[model samples]
Target: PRDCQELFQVGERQSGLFEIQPQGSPPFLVNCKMTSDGGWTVIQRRHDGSVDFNRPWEAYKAGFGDPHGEFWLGLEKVHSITGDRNSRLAVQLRDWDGNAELLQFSVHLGGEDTAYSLQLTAPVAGQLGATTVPPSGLSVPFSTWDQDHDLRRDKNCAKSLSGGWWFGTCSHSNLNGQYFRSIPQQRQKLKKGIFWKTWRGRYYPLQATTMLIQPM
Candidate 1:
């Protein structure tokens, strides 16, 4: 049943063929499997067709157009994948509620650079599986913490934040940054440890993480 589908056979990621759906759903496939362990871990398939799985975002970036013609990934690094393009873009967090909900996100010290996962907090319009406008944001990943480094370096953060000497107070307090969208205009940091974003009629604060761009 389409409700229960297997995107890849066992071990298909080592050497396999993939086509671009590029629209509607699962925009691209770097590697997929029957097991849930894959957890959207993206990998880059070299021009030589060798795959590098560490950088899921890079793997995802390579999928925008006619695979190679647009991003140009050969066994040799493309003009882009010089060092790392993953962090160059950020995993976005926004409010989709009827109003532009205010929000700010943060994490503990050791928790930085560790994976932060997002899941449906209340089953709002969110899902990669839900293709219709009815549940448009279901795939946005409602819950789960990401690696700390990614959170600290959020592209949206730059506008709201000023540089800090340290991001930790011995894991006691979060690496502080300004989130202007707080409930009260005077509140620079979030009210509590966590925050939420809505699914519609809202704009992600700061900036839209660049989808794809030159290394230049």
Candidate 2:
């Protein structure tokens, strides 16, 4: 019949307070936002370790437009039912909260485990859209003799052959030194005129669909 009597006068009996049993859950909160040409947004709180918390606790948002190149902001689950197997998550760039601010990095799974602890914060900023240019000269030919010529003589033919043409001796058997011995070996075996002049001078202006963030 000791339902409620643990007061012990004026509350001066603190000995590690009190913590009887079950308190093994709570550690899943994520929020992110950023945009100034590097778009990004996310918010999560999902946890599925069982115990029937009555379901309903999952949220996610995504935008990841650009994060300074090679991007990938997906997959997150620290300890959900023994899943994050040997965890390995990452996201950097968090200098004070400006120069491309971003965070949420983690590391630790085994070997020399220092108990594991990593935190990153900086969220609040949005607006990104406008800056697109992705489409220029398509060409796909893995093999099979590069799809047997036709684009003016495949092998990425760029065109340039007047004065007949002769490789193993043809063009009327080298009729007049045949355009100076087959135009420098047909421009070194027609490598598509050096890949169409290096894809119109260096990948059409450094091919970049959309992605920006400049200020230091």
Candidate 3:
């Protein structure tokens, strides 16, 4: 099967580590999260900040962190698995107050040649939608500390935000960002925390965030 969704369709229900072989892509292990919506292949997760997201292009290209803990399931692998096919990007976010939000996007990720430029449509779910912030993630190139593809000519969004993501001018969202144990009192320090600007504003650090995808 190509992903956890297929596994789920065939009776696999456990939410844990599992090996999946995407079409034409080498087999790899990923954390499967089963839900009422079906099964999802977790691509990125940040909770305890055990893993550092402030990595280089190569690290983000190949991935980092532990599969069971905080991890990034690699861009190449993600590109191969999705294979530009029908898929849904699901961002599951939780705040310090335990409030949860789901952001879903019909997405297509370009290959590394295009800097893994992420193409996203309007929000299909969540309180923050099309009318919010103009879907800043639209066809934005992924930026890292080493590979600066962001639109801001004067600054590097990845370096300033302390993580990698599809940045446009900057700061509509930064899920792959620095994790803070608690809210920083200093405004400048708080801006670097993992954030989804439309919902929680730029200064609030989200408690946890999981980015997953499922082949539709």
Candidate 4:
């Protein structure tokens, strides 16, 4: 007799293959696996219109005009492992003038599968690290929209200031085991951004980056 509790029948092990279809665009296929360290490894096909895996960031910058676009897809892993479950992965878009804009997405990973999909917008900026907050703690650069005020506030510029720290996180997940964990309480400084005065009346900027997990 088969165990009704099992999601799949006998000889049915879960496979991690999924397709990402952005709005009004063709689908991008991906194959992924959970690592022993509780992280994930995703291998995406670099289609002609998709990201170029060979030249990596360079190719992305040339095509997208944003040196940070390549980092957007890679940022997902970091956000997952870090305790900032509320944070989001964003792709950078460039205007005709080459100005950068953030395009947030809602990403979801399938059960026991590497297949994931993304909605066009993020729910929020997600959580920021405690330490990432400036010394003043009065103004933490964050993104918020005020419908009544008809205003949208983003701190990417304020975060560039001195004493401003670039915020990032790391995460690990075990879909096969049904578990997720992230590290909190850490902050990295940004090399560029606005300069702000801290509580101590010192000026600085924050810079941050995330760690990538590879299959063992």
Candidate 5:
């Protein structure tokens, strides 16, 4: 099948590793996250901090971590999936206080040449917070410690925040950040923790985070 929806519709309900082959791309294994909302392909997940998110450029480009555990599905693979179809993105975040937030929106991503730039549009309505928004603005390229692509030339967001992300003058949202067990006591470590700005601001360290995408 080409996506989780197809597999789930065909009776694959359990969330686990499954193979999907997008047109013009070779088959690859992906974690199909099955939910009542339908089958969503898990692109990134961070829980328990078993896997390190502060990886190098090559690692971020090729992907790291385990599919059944904390992992990133890889940039080249993500480009292949979205390259041929439209998709909707979803982000689930949980804070140390046990508060959870769900953010959804329409999304498209550029290929590696574009540094896997992100494009968000038609954000879903009925979301919780007024500022509950996507990771960044319209178009922002992904950046890593070894490869700097953010617009801010003064500093590298990935290196500064100790994680990779599509940053705009640095970002208020970085799911692939240091997973702290509690809120950082030091001010310098505030922005280093997993964050979704609108949910709890940059200072709050999230307990868990999951980023998913489903074909539209």
Candidate 6:
């Protein structure tokens, strides 16, 4: 009889494993545990629960990204954690300083057993620190995987300039993520945004790289 009231079953609440899968959906089992002073170690396991071993796993020393209130993900190397795959887990940034080597990035656990990787670029995909965060904050997309029309600076093709901040450079922008900026205008620009376009449409399609951002 497994106790549903358990926090970190392994390591006495410092580490715990969770098995999650919809009745009609694929197995999305995952493991999380405290490794170092509030920090965590993320591991993607077999859906069948065989590779889970004991489950769960931990850590510390990473900064939490925006939406906590700062509304910014640092360019040096900052991001939030993952709740699951659907989170955009959007690591979608609210600002872009135009650092060619920096861009918003996301995270998830769907790349096969123990092969978790970063969701590193545009129209493509998608955490935190010192804390079940099995997970982490956003890694800038442009940090290493950024793309540019000219190939030197990473930038949005149609970003707006308002308040000296690069407007809408980190949000989702692809065929699916694309929405009418306004209902009347079926092309672009949304004074108010609704819904999200998942970050990663590549590398690992089966796994999601989502992030969360409050509605505008």
The Cα error of candidate 6 at residue 127, in Å, is 18
**TM-score per model over all chains:** 0.20, 0.16, 0.89, 0.22, 0.87, 0.23
Minimal lDDT window, size 10, model 6? 52-61
Off by over 4 Å in 2: 1-86, 101-114, 117-216
Model 6 reaches what TM-score against the true structure?
Answer: 0.23
The numbered model that scores best in lDDT is 3
Task: Please provide the root mean square deviation of candidate 6 (C-alpha atoms, Å).
Answer: 18.0
lDDT of 4: 0.23
Q: After superposition, how far is residue 132 of candidate 6 from its true place, in Å?
A: 32
Candidate 6, residue 47: CA error in Å?
Answer: 33
Residues 1-216 of candidate 3 have per-residue lDDT tens digits of 778988899989899998889888878888899988999989999889899888899999999998878999899988877777768889999998899998787778888888987776555322334454455545668889888875557877778778788776566788888899886778787777788888888778998999999876
Q: Tell me each candidate's RMSD, in Å, in order.
A: 17.9, 25.1, 2.9, 16.2, 3.6, 18.0
Whole-model lDDT, model 2:
0.20
Which candidate leads in TM-score?
3
For 1-216, candidate 5 gives per-residue lDDT tens digits of 877888888889898889999878889999988988789988898889899889887888888998778999898888877884568788999877788888777767888888888765424321322254554445668988889775656767788887788765565688888988865668589788787777787677888898898878
Question: For model 1, where is the 10-residue window of minimal lDDT?
Answer: 207-216
N/CA/C clash count, model 3: 0
> Model 4: residues >4 Å from true position, as ranges?
1-26, 30-33, 37-70, 74-190, 193-216
79-169 in candidate 1: lDDT tens per residue? 1121222211112322323232222222111111222212122222122222343422221211112212224443322223321112221
**Collision count for each candidate, in order:** 31, 0, 0, 29, 0, 54
lDDT for model 6: 0.24
Across 1-216, the per-residue lDDT of candidate 2 in tens digits comes to 000011222232332122111124333322222332221222111111111111111210111212222221212222221122322232222112223322332222221121112211121111111133233311221111222122444232212221111111111111101111122444433222111121232111111111111111
